[PDB]
Write a protein that binds this DNA or RNA. Structure first.
Lengths: 95, 95, 222, 79, 107, 155
DNA sequence: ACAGGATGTATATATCTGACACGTGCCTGGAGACTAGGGAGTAATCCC
DNA sequence: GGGATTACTCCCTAGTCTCCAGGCACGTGTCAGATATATACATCCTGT
C-alpha cells in the first residue's frame, strides 16, 4: 500500500490544544503540512550552512537556535527560542 | 442607472471577499497545453497540476494588479494603463 | 425504488422508456402543487398503476390529481370538475343537505372502471368488533384561565406571541397540557448572601471540587 | 490561439480583486502577454522536472518545484 | 523496559524521532546533535500554534467552526512577522485582504 | 406537576381502570413534547412503557415494537399519530387511547387499523378524549363531515 | 380604489439524503542498550 | 585584543540487533440540510 507520512495528527493535536471547539478543512490541512515542511527545510538548510561555515560536521541545538534567530523576525523568533530552550531543557532533565 | 463608479466598487467588494478562481477552467487548460506543446510532445497533465498553475497564475496577476493600481494612483489617476504595469514589472525586476 | 429518488433521477429516467409505472402509495402523491406528482407526469408509461391508502380529503383536488392524471378524456376534465368544485363546496352544503343527484350516478358511470372496491365486510367477518367510546372532559381553573387568556390574546391581537397557529394549535395545546407553554422549574427562596459564580462550563470538565463559598453581604469590619 | 481564451471580463474580475476601479483598453492585451510569459517560464521548468524524472506526465509536484525555484512557493498541493 | 517517546520527554507534540530521522537522511550534516530534533520540533510546534490560534480567531469572526484556507490567509497577512515569513509564499484558495484605497472611495 | 388537566385526569382514572383490567394499551399524539411529559408522568406513577416516534432509527423502531410484541407486561406505548402509518404490527395491543383528534380521519382510523389488525384476537376499544366548548370539538365535527362525504362517495 | 385569488407565513410534525464525523486491522520506523571511533572541547601559544 | 593554530583528553553520536506501538489505510455511523404535509390567517398584486 506504501504508506505516506504526514504531519496531520500533530497539527490536529495542536489545534485541539489551542482551539478545542474548532475544526479544520482538508485543504487547510495540506497547507499547514506544506508550511511545516517549508520551515523545516529552511531552518535545517540554514543550520547546515552554519555547520559548514565553521568547519563543523555536527548540527547541535546551537546551530538550530542561530538559524531561528536569522529566519524568524522579531518577537516570533524570541518566543520560538523560548519554547525551544524550554523543550530542550525539559528533555535534558527527564532522561 | 448607477453613476459610473458605484458598480465597480461593488465588484471590488464582491471579489475581495471571494476566494474561488476567476479565470475559466477549460480555456486556461487549453492555454497551458498550448504553451506546453513547445517543450514536450504528447504531454499528459494532472488535474491538480493545472489547478496549481491556475492558482499561482491568478495570484500573480492579482498581486501585479495591486502594484499596477498603486502606480496608477501615484500618477494622480484612477485608471490603470500599460505604463503602470510596465513600471510595476520594472521595479519588481522582471522586465 | 422510492420517491425522492425519482425526483432526483427524473432527468435520467425520462430517457428510460417504461411499460409499467406502479405507484403504490399516492397518498404520498395526495395533492397537486407537488413536485413529486409533476415528475411523475413527465414519463412515457403505457400502464401507470395507481395505488394509495384510499382516496382521502374531499377537497377533491386530490380527486382531480387522481382522475385526470390517471386517464385521458378526463385528462383536462378536472377543470370541468372546477364547476364540480362548485359541486365540491356544495358537497359541504350537502353534507348539511343530502338531497342532490347530479354527479353520483355519473360517478357510477365513471367508477365502474377506474376503481375496484373490496369491503371491510369481506374482511371483518374474520375479525371481531371495534367500538369507539367517547369521553368528555373539562378545563381546570388554571387551564380555563390560560384558555381565556388566549381569548384575551385574540381580544388584544384581533384588536404577545401572536402566531395564528399559536392561536389554534395552542388552543389545542391548552387542551392537552398547560405546561408546554412555559413553566417555571423547581424553585427556592431568595438568597441574600454572596456565593461564588462558576465561570464557564467548558473548563471544569470532570473532576471538580465544590467549595462552601457562602458568605453574607452584610459585613462587619473590625 | 488560446491566449484569447482569457477573456476581457476575466481580466476585469482579476483587476477588481486587485482593487482597480477603472481599467484601460490596452490593459487586457498586456495582461495576456504577462500571463503568457509567466506560464511559459513556470511550465518550462515544470516540464524540465518531468523529463528529468523520465515521465511523460507532468505532476503537481513538478509545478510546486518549478514555482518554488522561481521564488513563488505554493502551499496546498504538496511539498 | 517500558519505552517512552522522545516527544513526551521533551513535553512536545511534534515527533522528535521523525525530525531526527529527516535531519539524518536529509543530507544536512554528517552528524547531528541530540538537542537539534527537540529544538526544531519545538519551534515548528510553536509556529503551528501561533498560526492556528489567529486562524481560529478569523474562523470565529466568519461564524464558522472549521478553519478554511481563507482564515489562514487572513491570519498570516495581518500578522506582519508571519507575513514577512511567508512573503514569497502563495496560499491556495486564500484570496486577498479586503483593502480599497482612499482615492477610489466615493466623493 | 403534570396533573392540572381534565384530559389527564380522566386519563388517570381510565389508566387505573385498565391496570385493573390488565390490558396494555397505547398512546397517539401529534406533538411529541406532550409525549415526553407523559413519559415523565408514567415513569412517575410507575408504569412500564415504551416510546416510538420518528426520532428513533428504523432498526430501533422495528426492534422495540418486536420487544413489545414478544413481552406481555410492558403496559403503555408512546407513538406519533401520523408516523404510526407504517407497516408496524400491534396484535398484542388490545386497547387504544387517542389523546388527540386531528384533521385526517384516515390517519386516525389507520392507526386504529394498526391496532385492529388482521391478526387481532379480541375486541379492541378506542377512547377518543374530548374536551368541552373548545376547538377539538370543531376539528372532530369537520373531520366527521369529511369522513361522511368520503364514505358516501365510495360507498 | 377596493375586492378576490394568488402566493407567503407560521407552528408543529414527518421522511430521506449529504458530507461530514468516528472506529479498527496492522506494518515499519522509533526506542532501548551498547561499544568505540572521533569530532569537539579546551588549555596553551604564536603573532596578525 | 584576539583570531589561528596546535597538542590532547574525552564525551557524544554513528552503528546495530531487537522489537513494539503509534500512525497509515480503510471500515462504519451522525446530525445538517433539504423537502414534504396541514391550517389556518396574513398579505400583496392585479384587475375590475
Amino acid at each position: 500500500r506504501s504508506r505516506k507520512e504526514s504531519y496531520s495528527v500533530y497539527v490536529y493535536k495542536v489545534l485541539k490544544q489551542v482551539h478545542p471547539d474548532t475544526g479544520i478543512s482538508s485543504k487547510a490541512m495540506g497547507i499547514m503540512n506544506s508550511f511545516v515542511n517549508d520551515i523545516f527545510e529552511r531552518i535545517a538548510g540554514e543550520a547546515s550552512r552554519l555547520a559548514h561555515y565553521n568547519k563543523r560536521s555536527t548540527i547541535t541545538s546551537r546551530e538550530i537556535q542561530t538559524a531561528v534567530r536569522l529566519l524568524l523576525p522579531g518577537e516570533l523568533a524570541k518566543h520560538a527560542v523560548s519554547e525551544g530552550t524550554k523543550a530542550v531543557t525539559k528533555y535534558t532533565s527527564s532522561k | 442607472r448607477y453613476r459610473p463608479g458605484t458598480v465597480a466598487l461593488r465588484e471590488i467588494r464582491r471579489y475581495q471577499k471571494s476566494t474561488e478562481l476567476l479565470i475559466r477552467k477549460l480555456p486556461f487548460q487549453r492555454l497551458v497545453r498550448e504553451i506546453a506543446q513547445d517543450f514536450k510532445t504528447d504531454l499528459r497533465f494532472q488535474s491538480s497540476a493545472v489547478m496549481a498553475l491556475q492558482e499561482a497564475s491568478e495570484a500573480y496577476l492579482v498581486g501585479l494588479f495591486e502594484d499596477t493600481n498603486l502606480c496608477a494612483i501615484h500618477a494622480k489617476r484612477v485608471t490603470i494603463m500599460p505604463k503602470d504595469i510596465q513600471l510595476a514589472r520594472r521595479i519588481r525586476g522582471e522586465r | 425504488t422510492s420517491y425522492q429518488l425519482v425526483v432526483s433521477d427524473v432527468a435520467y429516467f425520462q430517457k428510460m422508456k417504461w411499460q409499467y409505472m406502479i405507484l403504490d402509495e399516492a397518498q404520498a402523491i395526495k395533492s397537486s402543487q407537488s413536485s413529486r406528482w409533476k415528475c411523475l407526469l413527465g414519463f412515457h408509461c403505457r400502464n401507470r398503476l395507481l395505488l394509495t391508502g384510499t382516496p382521502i380529503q374531499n377537497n377533491m383536488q386530490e380527486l382531480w390529481a387522481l382522475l385526470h392524471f390517471i386517464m385521458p378524456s378526463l385528462f383536462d376534465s378536472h377543470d370541468e370538475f372546477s364547476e364540480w368544485f362548485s359541486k365540491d363546496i356544495e358537497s359541504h352544503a350537502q353534507s348539511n343537505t343530502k338531497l342532490n343527484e347530479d354527479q353520483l350516478k355519473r360517478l357510477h358511470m365513471i367508477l365502474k372502471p377506474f376503481m375496484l372496491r373490496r369491503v371491510k365486510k369481506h374482511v371483518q367477518k374474520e375479525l371481531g368488533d371495534k367500538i369507539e367510546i367517547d369521553v368528555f372532559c373539562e378545563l381546570s381553573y388554571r387551564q380555563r384561565a390560560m384558555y381565556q387568556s388566549l381569548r384575551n390574546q385574540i381580544s388584544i391581537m384581533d384588536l404577545d406571541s401572536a402566531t395564528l397557529m399559536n392561536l389554534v394549535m395552542q388552543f389545542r395545546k391548552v387542551c392537552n397540557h398547560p405546561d408546554l407553554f412555559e413553566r417555571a422549574d423547581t424553585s427556592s427562596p431568595f438568597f441574600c448572601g454572596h456565593f461564588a459564580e462558576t465561570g464557564s462550563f467548558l473548563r471544569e470538565g470532570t473532576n471538580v471540587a465544590l467549595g462552601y463559598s457562602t458568605r453574607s453581604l452584610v459585613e462587619y469590619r473590625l | 490561439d488560446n491566449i484569447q481564451g482569457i477573456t476581457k471580463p476575466a481580466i476585469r474580475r482579476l483587476a477588481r480583486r486587485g482593487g482597480v476601479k477603472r481599467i484601460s483598453g490596452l490593459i487586457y492585451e498586456e495582461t495576456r502577454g504577462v500571463l503568457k510569459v509567466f506560464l511559459e517560464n513556470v511550465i518550462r521548468d515544470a516540464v524540465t522536472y518531468t523529463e528529468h524524472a523520465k515521465r511523460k506526465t507532468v505532476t503537481a509536484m513538478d509545478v510546486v518545484y518549478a514555482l518554488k525555484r522561481q521564488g513563488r512557493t505554493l502551499y496546498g498541493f504538496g511539498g | 523496559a517500558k519505552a517512552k517517546t522522545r516527544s513526551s520527554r521533551a513535553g512536545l507534540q511534534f515527533p522528535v524521532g521523525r525530525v531526527h530521522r529527516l535531519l539524518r537522511k536529509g543530507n544536512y550534516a554528517e552528524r547531528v546533535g541530540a538537542g537539534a530534533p527537540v529544538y526544531l520540533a519545538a519551534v515548528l510546534e510553536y509556529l503551528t500554534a501561533e498560526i492556528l490560534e489567529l486562524a481560529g480567531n478569523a474562523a470565529r469572526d466568519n461564524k464558522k467552526t472549521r478553519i478554511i484556507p481563507r482564515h489562514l490567509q487572513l491570519a498570516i497577512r495581518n500578522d506582519e512577522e508571519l507575513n514577512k515569513l511567508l512573503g514569497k509564499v502563495t496560499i491556495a484558495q486564500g484570496g486577498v485582504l479586503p483593502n480599497i484605497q482612499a482615492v477610489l472611495l466615493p466623493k | 406537576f403534570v396533573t392540572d388537566s381534565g384530559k389527564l385526569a380522566k386519563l388517570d382514572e381510565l389508566l387505573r381502570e385498565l391496570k385493573e383490567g390488565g390490558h396494555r394499551v397505547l398512546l397517539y399524539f401529534q406533538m411529541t413534547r406532550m409525549i415526553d411529559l407523559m413519559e415523565e408522568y408514567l415513569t412517575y406513577r410507575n408504569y412500564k412503557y415504551c416510546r416510538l416516534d420518528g426520532s428513533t432509527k428504523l432498526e430501533d423502531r422495528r426492534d422495540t415494537v418486536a420487544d413489545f410484541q414478544t413481552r406481555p407486561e410492558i403496559f403503555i406505548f408512546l407513538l406519533s399519530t401520523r408516523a404510526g402509518g407504517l407497516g408496524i404490527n400491534l396484535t398484542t395491543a388490545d386497547t387504544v387511547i387517542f389523546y388527540d383528534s386531528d384533521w385526517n380521519p384516515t390517519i386516525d382510523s389507520q392507526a386504529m387499523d394498526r391496532a385492529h389488525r388482521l391478526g387481532q384476537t379480541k375486541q379492541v376499544t378506542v377512547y377518543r378524549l374530548i374536551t368541552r366548548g373548545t376547538i377539538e370539538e370543531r376539528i372532530r365535527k369537520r373531520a366527521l363531515q369529511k369522513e361522511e362525504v368520503q364514505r358516501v362517495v365510495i360507498t
